[PDB]
Amino acid sequence: MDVLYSLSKTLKDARDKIVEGTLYSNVSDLIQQFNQMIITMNGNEFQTGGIGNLPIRNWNFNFGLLGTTLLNLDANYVETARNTIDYFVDFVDNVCMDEMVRESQRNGIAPQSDSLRKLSAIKFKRINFDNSSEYIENWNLQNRRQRTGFTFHKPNIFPYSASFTLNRSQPAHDNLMGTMWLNAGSEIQVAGFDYSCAINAPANIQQFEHIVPLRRVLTTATITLLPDAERFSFPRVINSADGATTWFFNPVILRPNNVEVEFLLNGQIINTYQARFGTIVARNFDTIRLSFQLMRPPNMTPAVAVLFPNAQPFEHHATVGLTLRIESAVCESVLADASETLLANVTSVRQEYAIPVGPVFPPGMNWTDLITNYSPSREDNLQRVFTVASIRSMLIK
């Protein structure tokens, strides 16, 4: 594993630094590492491919050594380096694209492809230059059993389940009382609604609780919070839960009262926030519990008095607003986000060569379905695939 990343880093630095007209006393270490690598790899045979549409290719390292005695690199040395560099980058691209699409139902953290199995011997461990990227450091520290961490911007961790709940219901939908929520992507939007506007309620106060769990823990989260639901404040008609009927939604937005948000871990109170509406920070949490109360307006103008009648039939229905967004977080297991080019590369290198659906990953590399049943074996397989993708993401961008 680490050997492949070391080779990739060596190739990337060779691409960056081997240009005509440089000083040898600036790239001496890179040239030494390159020469050691070409000495080690010379005289071996490799086989890559086997599944899907990836071709069966045979690779042999038979390149000659590179001189280091010239004080300034010239065009001849430039092309001599470049030819072998291109060959090596093609080889590493092939082995990475082979390893990416293979997985196992057990022991997924271990290598499975033939090339990665062969490159895990004892002698080849004499080539390991640098581990400077975040993913390689995470892998190395995880293998040594210490604190891991992956940075993210807008982490896509919330599963997609646009479900609504009703408590006070009628077959004809004439007076309702329940909660409708949308938790998609990195944003949570909830809205508690009542058709009676708390007119026959215990002291004109109606409560709404919403609990949203997370499959994996999170740390160091900055939260953007606004008191207005941006999606559930428009006249809508949605099919009911009966599966054969539809009901109408006529919203009028008030401001939510007693807006309490709880960030709890392991059934213990960690942080509480009341009467605050954004840019709040919670240190360590796993489960978020949002609760709020809808209250009848204590005093009204004539228009509001006409709009909300004490009788049964209603024209407009009251609803409160709330939206929560997570900005940055660091997790212990690899995830997906909107700031990394890794998930797209993985899906592309999978679907390009028509890999059949495996035993663990659901077909199509769907992320919502995968995260719905997040499992430790899936965690290890995702970690392996994403780490190999990150390694590849430097050979050719």
Binding site: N35, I39, G43, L65, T68
Partner: protein, 49 residues
């Protein structure tokens, strides 16, 4: 010196890298330099000590 030492050591005709006995019959490999030689340009399949 360390990058040319392998070539320097291979160049001498009074020194050799090693020997394989293999305890089995082998067809002699032909070469252009010498008529028939026990050339073994690798140590594949045999334990190294």
């Amino acid at each position: 010196i360390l990058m040319a030492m392998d070539q320097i050591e291979r160049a001498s005709d009074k020194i050799a890298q090693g020997v394989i006995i293999a305890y089995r019959d082998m067809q002699l490999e032909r070469d252009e330099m010498y008529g028939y030689v026990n050339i073994a340009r690798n140590l594949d399949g045999f334990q190294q000590i």
